[PDB]
Design a protein around this ligand. Structure first.
Ligand SMILES: *[C@@H](CC(=O)OCC)[C@H](C[C@@H]1CCNC1=O)NC(=O)[C@H](Cc1ccccc1)NC(=O)[C@H](CCC(=O)OC(C)(C)C)NC(=O)OCc1ccccc1
Ligand SMILES: *[C@@H](CC(=O)OCC)[C@H](C[C@@H]1CCNC1=O)NC(=O)[C@H](Cc1ccccc1)NC(=O)[C@H](CCC(=O)OC(C)(C)C)NC(=O)OCc1ccccc1
Lengths: 181, 181
């Protein structure tokens, strides 16, 4: 648990930001170059608020699998000269299962807060927000509004992004290496 | 930072609880025997709600120094057969200063959340909530309502209990070994 927290803190410091869209406030994880990720329901427009700053969105892909089914992730290209530290090496080729994970949030609401969520299990199918959704990772923690975009990690691994909950369990969309080339 | 988180998680698991009083919801740290601590402003009555459960308060000391000055801590004797694990060994004889601390919260609002608050400095005097108050530990973190009772820790050390903030800094009352005999 210790090293997983240490890893999470350094990842949030280097690669994470607080984002506001017309749809609420989110944690945002920068991945490589100028590409970052939000939950698809953040519904980012032409311009987002990133650490209170008007940033232009050059391009935005809502992710779907081979059937055209929703993965609940939007990739965003940001109009800024700073490049993110490339964290593709920390992203698995397939859904990861883990016994201890930490969920990391960085919003006005939950500023630099870290949650030990316990066991993460692959949960693949889930009817999320009414929508059938694949590649969900599940943890038994009472997750709330304001936590979306939260980054789920274990030692040296970025597992997924928090996208929903049913009041008793939370679910991350798996953040897979092939989404980023 | 890793071992401090590991220490904090195990301390909250063993010794902490969520308490509701007429004055709000708090994190509560059990110390030894049947004695626990809240911020004095929790203003615990004859009966508190402890993890949703009606618990009787046998005795309650609001703490003050030698001048009769407020320390912003209430010690509570609880009417329950379970004794807390004795954590007096983790309590310093005087105010502790540290470069990395973790603040741990356990409420409905902030369930099992851990915050790396950075440097803790002894701050002794502060006019808190209008009231002159001594033995304050300071950290530069945007602490909010709902975080009172939060437990401030470093590796193998319980430093104090979170009792206030001014929107930019937070302050813990130092939890000193001599308060508990
Ligand atoms: C993040 C929002 C955020 O950060 O706020 C910005 C300020 C939310 C976290 C969730 C909500 C409750 N707990 C959480 O961890 N995420 C959501 O709100 C998403 C949003 C969304 C929108 C559109 C399409 C897809 C996703 N939705 C859910 O988590 C969803 C909402 C259901 C719900 O409780 O809210 C109401 C108000 C609409 C009723 N949860 C869900 O579908 O799971 C329930 C379920 C599970 C299994 C089978 C059937 C239903
Ligand atoms: C914990 C409350 C909680 O858990 O809610 C239960 C559901 C609060 C955390 C604080 C509040 C804001 N940020 C925090 O970290 N703590 C308090 O509210 C305490 C309460 C209290 C009451 C009576 C006597 C002593 C303490 N008070 C403060 O933190 C205090 C409040 C000032 C304030 O901003 O609130 C208003 C609404 C009353 C204006 N803060 C304070 O005095 O510091 C300001 C200051 C610093 C230095 C010099 C002069 C003023």
């Amino acid at each position: 648990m210790g090293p997983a927290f240490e890893f999470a803190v350094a990842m949030m410091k280097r690669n994470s930001s607080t984002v506001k869209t017309e749809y609420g406030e989110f944690t945002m994880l920068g991945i490589y170059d100028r590409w970052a990720v939000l939950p698809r329901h953040a519904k980012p427009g032409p311009t987002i608020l990133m650490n209170d700053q008007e940033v232009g969105v050059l391009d935005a892909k809502e992710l779907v699998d081979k059937d055209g089914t929703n993965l609940e992730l939007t990739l965003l290209k940001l109009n800024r000269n700073e490049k993110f530290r490339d964290i593709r090496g920390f992203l698995a080729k397939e859904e990861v299962e883990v016994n201890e994970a930490v969920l990391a949030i960085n919003t006005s609401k939950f500023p630099n807060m870290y949650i030990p969520v316990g066991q993460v299990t692959e949960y693949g199918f889930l009817n999320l927000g009414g929508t059938p959704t694949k590649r969900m990772l599940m943890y038994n923690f009472p997750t709330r509004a304001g936590q979306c975009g939260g980054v789920l990690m274990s030692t040296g691994k970025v597992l997924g992004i928090h996208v929903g909950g049913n009041g008793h369990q939370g679910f991350s969309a798996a953040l897979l290496k092939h989404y980023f080339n």
